Amino acid sequence: RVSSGRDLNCVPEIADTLGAVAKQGFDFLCMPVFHPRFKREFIQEPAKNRPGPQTRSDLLLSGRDWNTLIVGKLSPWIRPDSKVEKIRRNSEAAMLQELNFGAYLGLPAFLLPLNQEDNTNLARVLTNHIHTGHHSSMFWMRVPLVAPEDLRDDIIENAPTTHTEEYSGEEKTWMWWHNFRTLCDYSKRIAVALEIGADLPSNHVIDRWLGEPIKAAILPTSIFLTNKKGFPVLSKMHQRLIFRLLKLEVQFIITGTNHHSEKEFCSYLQYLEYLSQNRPPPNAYELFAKGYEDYLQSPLQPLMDNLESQTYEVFEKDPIKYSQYQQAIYKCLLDRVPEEEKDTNVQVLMVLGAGRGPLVNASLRAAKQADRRIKLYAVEKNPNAVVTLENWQFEEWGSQVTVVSSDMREWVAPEKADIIVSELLGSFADNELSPECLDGAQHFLKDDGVSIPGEYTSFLAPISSSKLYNEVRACREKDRDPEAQFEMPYVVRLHNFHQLSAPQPCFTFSHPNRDPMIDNNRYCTLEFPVEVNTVLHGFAGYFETVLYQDITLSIRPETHSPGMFSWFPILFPIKQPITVREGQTICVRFWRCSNSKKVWYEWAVTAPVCSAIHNPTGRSYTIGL
Amino acid sequence: RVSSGRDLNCVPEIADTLGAVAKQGFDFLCMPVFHPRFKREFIQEPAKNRPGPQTRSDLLLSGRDWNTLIVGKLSPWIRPDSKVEKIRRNSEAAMLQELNFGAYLGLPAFLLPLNQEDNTNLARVLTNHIHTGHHSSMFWMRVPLVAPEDLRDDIIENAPTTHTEEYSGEEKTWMWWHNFRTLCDYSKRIAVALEIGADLPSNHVIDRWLGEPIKAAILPTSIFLTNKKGFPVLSKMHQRLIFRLLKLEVQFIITGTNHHSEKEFCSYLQYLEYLSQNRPPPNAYELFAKGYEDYLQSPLQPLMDNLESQTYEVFEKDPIKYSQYQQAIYKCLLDRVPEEEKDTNVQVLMVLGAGRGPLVNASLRAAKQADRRIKLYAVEKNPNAVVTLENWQFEEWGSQVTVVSSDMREWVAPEKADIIVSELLGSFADNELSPECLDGAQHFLKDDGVSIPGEYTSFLAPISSSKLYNEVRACREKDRDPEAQFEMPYVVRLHNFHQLSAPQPCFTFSHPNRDPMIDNNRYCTLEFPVEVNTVLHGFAGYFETVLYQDITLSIRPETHSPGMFSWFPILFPIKQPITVREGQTICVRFWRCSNSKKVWYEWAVTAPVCSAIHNPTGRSYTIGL
Amino acid sequence: LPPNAPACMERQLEAARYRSDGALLLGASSLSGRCWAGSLWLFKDPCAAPNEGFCSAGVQTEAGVADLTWVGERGILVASDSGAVELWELDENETLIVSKFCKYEHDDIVSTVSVLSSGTQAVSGSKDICIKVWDLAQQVVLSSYRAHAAQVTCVAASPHKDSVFLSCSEDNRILLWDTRCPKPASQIGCSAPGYLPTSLAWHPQQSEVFVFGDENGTVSLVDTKSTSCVLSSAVHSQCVTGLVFSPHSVPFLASLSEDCSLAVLDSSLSELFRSQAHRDFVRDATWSPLNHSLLTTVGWDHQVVHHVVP
Amino acid sequence: LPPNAPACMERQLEAARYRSDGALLLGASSLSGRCWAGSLWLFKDPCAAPNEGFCSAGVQTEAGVADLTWVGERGILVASDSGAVELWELDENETLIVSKFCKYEHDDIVSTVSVLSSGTQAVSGSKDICIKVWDLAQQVVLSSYRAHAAQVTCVAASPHKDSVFLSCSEDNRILLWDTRCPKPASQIGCSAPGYLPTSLAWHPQQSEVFVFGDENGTVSLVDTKSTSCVLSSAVHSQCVTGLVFSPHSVPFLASLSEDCSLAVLDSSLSELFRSQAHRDFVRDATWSPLNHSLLTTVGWDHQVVHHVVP
Ligand SMILES: CSC[C@H]1O[C@@H](n2cnc3c(N)ncnc32)[C@H](O)[C@@H]1O
Numbered sequence A, B: 001r002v003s004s005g006r007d008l009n010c011v012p013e014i015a016d017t018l019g020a021v022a023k024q025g026f027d028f029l030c031m032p033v034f035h036p037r038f039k040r041e042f043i044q045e046p047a048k049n050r051p052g053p054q055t056r057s058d059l060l061l062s063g064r065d066w067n068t069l070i071v072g073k074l075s076p077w078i079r080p081d082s083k084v085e086k087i088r089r090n091s092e093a094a095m096l097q098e099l100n101f102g103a104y105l106g107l108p109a110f111l112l113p114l115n116q117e118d119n120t121n122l123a124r125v126l127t128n129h130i131h132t133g134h135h136s137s138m139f140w141m142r143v144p145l146v147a148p149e150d151l152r153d154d155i156i157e158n159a160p161t162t163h164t165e166e167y168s169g170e171e172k173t174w175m176w177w178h179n180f181r182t183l184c185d186y187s188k189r190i191a192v193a194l195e196i197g198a199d200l201p202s203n204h205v206i207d208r209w210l211g212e213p214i215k216a217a218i219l220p221t222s223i224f225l226t227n228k229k230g231f232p233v234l235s236k237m238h239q240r241l242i243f244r245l246l247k248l249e250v251q252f253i254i255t256g257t258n259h260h261s262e263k264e265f266c267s268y269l270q271y272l273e274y275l276s277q278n279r280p281p282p283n284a285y286e287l288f289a290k291g292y293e294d295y296l297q298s299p300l301q302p303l304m305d306n307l308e309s310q311t312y313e314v315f316e317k318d319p320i321k322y323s324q325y326q327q328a329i330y331k332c333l334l335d336r337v338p339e340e341e342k343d344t345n346v347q348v349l350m351v352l353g354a355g356r357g358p359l360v361n362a363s364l365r366a367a368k369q370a371d372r373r374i375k376l377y378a379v380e381k382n383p384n385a386v387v388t389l390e391n392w393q394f395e396e397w398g399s400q401v402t403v404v405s406s407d408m409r410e411w412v413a414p415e416k417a418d419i420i421v422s423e424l425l426g427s428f429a430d431n432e433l434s435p436e437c438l439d440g441a442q443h444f445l446k447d448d449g450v451s452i453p454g455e456y457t458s459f460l461a462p463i464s465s466s467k468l469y470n471e472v473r474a475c476r477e478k479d480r481d482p483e484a485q486f487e488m489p490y491v492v493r494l495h496n497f498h499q500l501s502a503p504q505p506c507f508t509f510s511h512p513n514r515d516p517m518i519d520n521n522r523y524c525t526l527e528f529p530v531e532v533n534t535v536l537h538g539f540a541g542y543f544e545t546v547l548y549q550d551i552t553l554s555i556r557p558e559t560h561s562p563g564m565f566s567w568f569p570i571l572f573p574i575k576q577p578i579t580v581r582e583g584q585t586i587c588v589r590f591w592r593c594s595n596s597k598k599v600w601y602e603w604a605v606t607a608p609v610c611s612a613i614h615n616p617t618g619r620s621y622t623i624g625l
Numbered sequence C, D: 001l002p003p004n005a006p007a008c009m010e011r012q013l014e015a016a017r018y019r020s021d022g023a024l025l026l027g028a029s030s031l032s033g034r035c036w037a038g039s040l041w042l043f044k045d046p047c048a049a050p051n052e053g054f055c056s057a058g059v060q061t062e063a064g065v066a067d068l069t070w071v072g073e074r075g076i077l078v079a080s081d082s083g084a085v086e087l088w089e090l091d092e093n094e095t096l097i098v099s100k101f102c103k104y105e106h107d108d109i110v111s112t113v114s115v116l117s118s119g120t121q122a123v124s125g126s127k128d129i130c131i132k133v134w135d136l137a138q139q140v141v142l143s144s145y146r147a148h149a150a151q152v153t154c155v156a157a158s159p160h161k162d163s164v165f166l167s168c169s170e171d172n173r174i175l176l177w178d179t180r181c182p183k184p185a186s187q188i189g190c191s192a193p194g195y196l197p198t199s200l201a202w203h204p205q206q207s208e209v210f211v212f213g214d215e216n217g218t219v220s221l222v223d224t225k226s227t228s229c230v231l232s233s234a235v236h237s238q239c240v241t242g243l244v245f246s247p248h249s250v251p252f253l254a255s256l257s258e259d260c261s262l263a264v265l266d267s268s269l270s271e272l273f274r275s276q277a278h279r280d281f282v283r284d285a286t287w288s289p290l291n292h293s294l295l296t297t298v299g300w301d302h303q304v305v306h307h308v309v310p
């Protein structure tokens, strides 16, 4: 349900305070590790020689408490970007001191403010702390949605607040964050503590933060309304944002004094729990996609590789998809055998890549449903899966099904097919080489034969996600090109991201392929109009396929087939993030390239700036033929 | 003098043609490897099955001729970015074919046009050829200063030429180049063949190309004027550009027919030779800097490391610098010993880092010149150099000079100094740790003592050079961070570059250093106004020092000391090039950082975009204490 | 030691305020060690302070004391680390100090308090960026102003005008307030935007002149009438924490800095006196009502120093 | 074989032009192998061609022949790979072919030549992007125009107006020229900017109508009067290399493509005839003066084909 902490800038006794906040139901406490007013001098006598202790003892809590219940806070006097040199130097020394203490204590996290535009020296000092011992602990940069200068009451007679709307200006707080994290070179240890105010800004301002590494949301007691019974509550717009933030599973932090003093402070927390339990629940997909959010996976290559038993089991675990296949064959059978010829006719149906036989069973259910007669071939190159097939056929199918242990491109079939059925499609449709496989099989399809599927189309969309950019970047391996991570696709349940433009079709294939000369190579140019300021990090891929006539399957969000939880989209990274201004077009170029040995994708962004061509000659990523 | 080739698009006999151009004095020939009109079909029968040969035989020249005298040319029908798919495919196949033939032949270079804005697919195909066997051979991208659309006669009644000046537009040809080389990921094999027209554009347009990898300049016979005797000649503005291009040592290519048909074609070449021999000659520095142009070197660390004999020899090879030192001491001696006290007085002069004794000898020449009396200490931690010193002192100096084999920070001196003299300065002044060394020595300087030098200041300037960006990038090593190349300074005779802004002071040190509490750490923010469109690749560093009063040394170009050829500037790279639009400010931030063990620089660009902080905690680069 | 008086005064001396009769009000915080709280002390013999046993009255506050002010002769208004402004009242016998009210209205540390000329109202400033106006008798907030865009460093009520007070913030604003204006705040100061303003003191007689100290140790004299920056001196090597006018007809001005020094300046901002007595931060100054040439400083070195000014 | 006539005709047949009497002019290039040159051939018996021994006259050119045109009945104007336009003259006995002039004025391959209606002037087009106008009798360039911004594909003189000619370029421009205008060129064509224009032919009788072929195999009929794109047909699977009108009162139009096919179209652009005879690129077409139903094609397959059109 909800993980939540209490923010305090006053801790008389660490013992009683921690106990109090536990009693109130808080999972953890954000507090200073040095007294916020206890300014320290490091250079000038005599204050430099101030007798210690400089703070309270580690001995006052268990190591386990320090490790789990305490988030430290930078003292508010610490100003590393001060224009006053002596303040800058004392702040550099104090910041290192407080960070070193948090690391001494084994704190899981530490809060640092981004409360102005220039945090260069603060970033330089934090980067130094990070590059001093490899440690796990998080740095939560406390940034507001709305800068305090843009929140101030219009009560200065000779300094009126600007009522002129400034699109870019209202987004200034995101740029504070972006510049800081860029200077600190996207450290995985540096995340956002997003501070929410009584006045939410424009949606565009909230959307800015979509793909950012938000670990915490800070709710001041101030922003809370009062119900008729005087309980704290939130505006519907505030509530909508909480629902958005619950999907990102952030920790909520309550800051400020009890302004609902008719009642206890658990009242604020009780409200959040109330919103959590009363969120619209997640669909089957969302229960399927449970631990997979932003988890990068290698795309399966069921041609080059032999899939494991449990891989086929997951393919089979989505019955709806096979009901679709059953329906396509059912329809195709009725279109091909008139009711007058039902008992004379018997169509040769060939499953090309039969795995453990779900399409074989769907083909059989389809024939009994159509009340029409079929002979079956089950073709499968994975001899491990042929074992499953041959046990099924001996025990159940009988001689109606001829299991063929062969590559469909090599197989010399005893007779031509009326219908070939296949599930040779990846998350980017042709990325398992369905085109090359079915091309090699089509010589044994009758001149009027049907391929199910008859067609498939890949779709791309530009996406922003600093989170996934960092996940990819983290996939550097020894003994290879240090940037190969970025020149390969990943299957991933894209979660913490922003889709910058509607998906556009990329590559399309049709079966049978009538072309007298056939080329499965492709070159596509796409233009994505972008209506927001953002950073491009990569391209989401999806697919649609026409099984038969109106019966389709899709993972494209606008046309998504129901129940097809089986099946996350693909991600094409780029090496360098690209800034996109509102109103600009992202131009991406994709190639499908081939040898006798290998098929691969190459891609480049040509607008609003050029990237390098990614994966030239399959140097980082190929698909085996 | 001049390396020059002949460009031809007509070669009836390769034998006679090559012989002809040799007789005319050309070093090499640019020609097609397939007949420029011989369009080839790869997909459609029957033209696909055209009987061969597809071109003329390798047997028609020696391997040596192919290797040295022949630059190949892409056939002009080859249009990989054609909007017509069949033309795109045949062009992809033909381009690979012609490139593969040039590689078959061992051609040293191959010409490809950039004659329009979209060369995406052409770049994709060239990148593929480059990623197919590691080969040395160059690709010369033929780009004009002025696009042919902007050169066309104003002779279309209903399509008038725009007489409205467009700053960015007139630079469109550089962007063609930039986008191509970005897509091909700065391959070192890809360079510019710059084509010059009868009408030169604005200087700004020429300046665009300053730091670019120009290997060849193409002069059409068209652009040549005629002298009274009817010889071909060039405008002064054309001539100025040739003088500019001679400094970059490009190969000149003559294209087009003889338009001075009263005379032979060697007349064009004879003109270039005439300009070469009649260029203003290079200063001593330029004769010194001869083979060092854009040669990246490790900055010397004479504290952490013991310099070799020949390193000291090069330091000594510039007498002017020591005459300056002699002058500073001479002056300081007269300011300190009144003519009345000349014979009573005797000043203790200590050379701190005496190397092989040039400052010892300068100190002695200074005392005889001033007719004043000095006792000398020669302090040197390099025991190899102490050998040179102790032979000098035994054989020549005698007991006036006490050689001390010690670190000046550790040495317990028998008496306090009137004057300490040192040459502890690198190309970025404090980069050899003169500050820390002289700080450690100052306890043995009299309360009124003089340090020569008394002051030094480092200067930075933003620079563009795609050439040096590629040199740095090429310095990846195994067993270290794959981007450490970019997080360290290089000493280099910067040659093929553009300085984007006037140098600004960075860090300054003074000796003696009176500060009651001393900090040699620094944080500096610099703002460089930029008046051109460009790409930032790094920062040039220089220094000035005040030896004494008005006597200085400088490698800063505006204040450069005469004869100080001894001494190239420094380069601070950045990992990612940064686009700068005319009128934008480059903001760079530099830190001088320290431990007890190490001193280092960290740096970041904060405008017009943020970089990563470079060299955080000296992870890539440190200077030993 | 008195009944209800702590055995031990916290080390960090925050405030020193003489009453009209010459009795000394002391505020102290515990800014390190296990327990981070504060204390209020009354010394009818000022020379005994800081020694706890020789105190007229003393009490323990839940949290540290950021700022203090006398409310008339028996009242003590407190800026707490807790976000509370608390009202403490002296005893009839003045033998103990009792909490009148403690209101948690500020979302962060209360940094600064001032009593307005009425004596029935006070202004609080906080790190939460808000400035609040207090009805002392009804113990409530009349107004809460988010004028500033960073933590409020100082609030100083006008001597004689109950609607007027200065504020300064790390947003680099000095605000002149009049609660009678529908837009109550007005941005005032030097020609040049300069170093952050740290300390404020109205001229006692001249109702439209004040002085401010900056984070760079500069002290400045300001005429609202000119809205011009009259006079500035570089008095300190560090931040000016406090500025206190003498009770003299032509007042002397006490300047206290984190440079651990006290300076006393003429009305031309020239320096008469300098004391290096403290060996830590100098937190407050109060001139004796009885002898106007006597000035008491307190510091985080726990020293109560009595200066004789020339 | 005749005196001065080569033993062997180069494989790549570039041009076929019937004279008024029915004699056949042949241009050929060597586009592969050791020697990259060309040849000019006269066949008074057209059915003997391409066989060299049965030729009326033949000569060797220094370089390949990109384009050709009859100049009256004894003159041959040549577009050379060398950047030269050369004038070749038939013998009195017409037994040999002799160079009248060879001028190296073009900086790259001369791609295209046309004789203007006067017969004393011609227009050249080149890959160097320039279009030149030639005084044939004084053998000089009257004018040189850089109108285009890419290689010039075709130049075609008006039938009856000595100042008027079309040009087309890979800059996607069709230019209508009149040397009597101070700005001589005018940009003409379809509503839609479309596929690069490759081939041009004026209507023989209608002095303000022409047709153009594109790189996508579309043939288009254009009225300068409408400046509108009247009619277009998809005639070829590849580039339209050439367009030739029949001598008929209502002319038929011969269409030749890199698709190695010939098509013959009515004036409505509908297709009457189609020949797959060639097994390489179809380079030219000339209708017989003698039998207007006879049409000779040449190809890079070295085939001289004689078609009977329905
Ligand atoms: C059910 S997932 C797709 C199935 O097709 C099989 N497959 C993929 N390519 C071929 C091929 N060319 N010939 C036969 N089976 C194939 C795979 O082994 C997998 O079981």
Ligand SMILES: CSC[C@H]1O[C@@H](n2cnc3c(N)ncnc32)[C@H](O)[C@@H]1O
Pocket: B302, B303, B306, B307, B315, B352, B353, B354, B355, B356, B379, B380, B381, B382, B385, B406, B407, B408, B409, B423, B424, B437
């Ligand atoms: C002549 S180049 C500078 C000289 O100073 C010497 N040097 C550098 N640092 C020190 C030091 N701390 N003590 C003594 N010699 C030094 C070096 O070995 C070198 O010969």
